[PDB]
C-alpha cells in the first residue's frame, strides 16, 4: 500500500493520530461482519506500527508539530491517512474473499489433499 500509493503532499501524522484514525475506520458499519478475532489482530498490528513510529521519531528529533528542518527525517516511518484507509479496506476484502464458499465440496478436497 505504501509503495503503490505513495502520497506526497499529505500530512504524514503519526502515533496518537494513527490509532485514532484506525479505530474510527474499524467502527464504520463494515468490519461488523468481519470476525471479531480478525478486527483485534488488525488493531494489534496497527498498535505495533504506532510504537515503531514513536521510537524512530524519538531517536531522530521528534516532530514538534510536523515542522522539523531536515524534511528527509519525515520519510523515516511515513504512513499517511490515504494509506491507512487503503490498508484497512484491502484487509477487509482479502479476509472476506478468503472465506470458504458454501457448497465447496469441503470433504472431497480434504481427502485428495491428504492423499497427494
Amino acid at each position: 500500500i505504501k509503495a503503490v500509493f505513495p502520497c506526497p503532499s499529505e500530512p504524514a501524522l503519526s502515533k496518537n493520530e494513527l490509532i485514532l484514525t484506525t479505530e474510527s475506520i474499524m467502527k464504520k458499519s463494515e468490519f461488523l461482519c468481519c470476525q471479531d478475532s480478525f478486527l483485534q489482530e488488525i488493531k494489534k498490528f496497527i498498535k505495533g506500527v504506532s510504537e515503531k513510529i514513536k521510537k524512530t521519531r524519538d531517536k531522530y528529533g521528534i516532530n514538534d508539530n510536523g515542522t522539523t528542518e531536515p524534511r528527509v527525517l519525515y520519510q523515516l516511518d511515513r504512513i499517511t491517512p490515504t494509506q491507512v484507509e487503503k490498508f484497512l479496506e484491502t484487509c477487509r476484502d482479502k479476509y472476506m474473499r478468503a472465506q470458504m464458499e458454501p457448497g465447496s465440496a469441503v470433504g472431497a478436497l480434504c481427502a485428495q489433499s491428504i492423499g497427494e
Binding site: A3, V4, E116
Partner: protein, 173 residues
C-alpha cells in the same frame, strides 16, 4: 477447472504453475549483476514478448542503467518488462524477500546479491531463483501478481517469461 483459476494448490495454497528448469536458469543468468546489454540486444530480447495479444501493446524501454562511458542496460531492467510490458499496464508489483544464498546480513547490500527487492514492477536487487520464480513458495512474484492484481496479470507475466527466458539462454549459451 481452468488453469488461470487453479494456479495454487488447495493443500497449502502454494503456487504450482510456475517457472521450471531452463526458464529458471535463463532468468537467474539475465538478472545477475554482470549482465549488461546494448540497445540492439535489449530491443531483440524485449521483442520476443510482443506476440499473442502483446502485438497491440506499445513496449516501454526503460532508460539504460549505464549512460556515459558507454550506454548500457542491465538484465534486471530487461526482466522488469515482463512484469510491466507497456506504460498503460496497471500492475505495480512489490516483493522484498531473501533469496537462497543470502549471506545472513545486510538485507539488500548482501555480498552474494541474493536479496530481492521489486518496486513498482522493477527488480532493484537480487537474482531470480526457484524461490522468487518457481513453484512451492508464497514469496513468488507470480503469487503476488495473482493475489494483488489478478489471475490474468499473473498468467500474462508467466507467458512473457516463457518467451524471454529461452531467447536469452539460446543466444548466451
Amino acid at each position: 477447472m481452468g488453469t488461470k483459476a487453479n494456479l495454487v494448490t488447495p493443500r497449502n495454497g502454494e503456487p504450482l504453475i510456475a517457472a521450471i528448469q531452463d526458464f529458471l536458469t535463463g532468468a537467474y543468468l539475465l538478472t545477475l549483476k554482470d549482465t549488461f546489454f546494448d540497445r540492439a540486444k535489449a530491443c531483440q530480447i524485449i521483442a520476443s514478448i510482443l506476440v499473442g495479444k502483446d502485438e497491440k501493446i506499445k513496449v516501454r524501454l526503460p532508460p539504460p542503467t549505464i549512460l556515459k562511458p558507454v550506454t548500457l542496460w542491465t538484465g534486471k531492467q530487461i526482466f522488469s518488462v515482463i512484469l510491466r510490458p507497456s506504460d498503460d499496464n496497471p500492475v505495480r508489483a512489490n516483493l522484498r524477500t531473501k533469496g537462497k544464498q543470502y549471506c545472513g546480513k545486510g538485507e539488500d547490500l548482501c555480498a552474494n546479491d541474493s536479496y530481492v527487492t521489486i518496486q513498482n514492477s522493477e527488480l532493484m536487487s537480487g537474482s531470480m531463483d526457484k524461490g522468487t520464480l518457481g513453484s512451492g513458495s508464497k514469496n513468488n512474484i507470480f503469487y503476488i501478481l495473482l493475489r494483488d492484481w489478478g489471475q490474468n496479470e499473473a498468467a500474462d507475466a508467466m507467458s512473457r517469461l516463457a518467451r524471454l527466458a529461452p531467447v536469452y539462454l539460446s543466444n548466451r549459451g
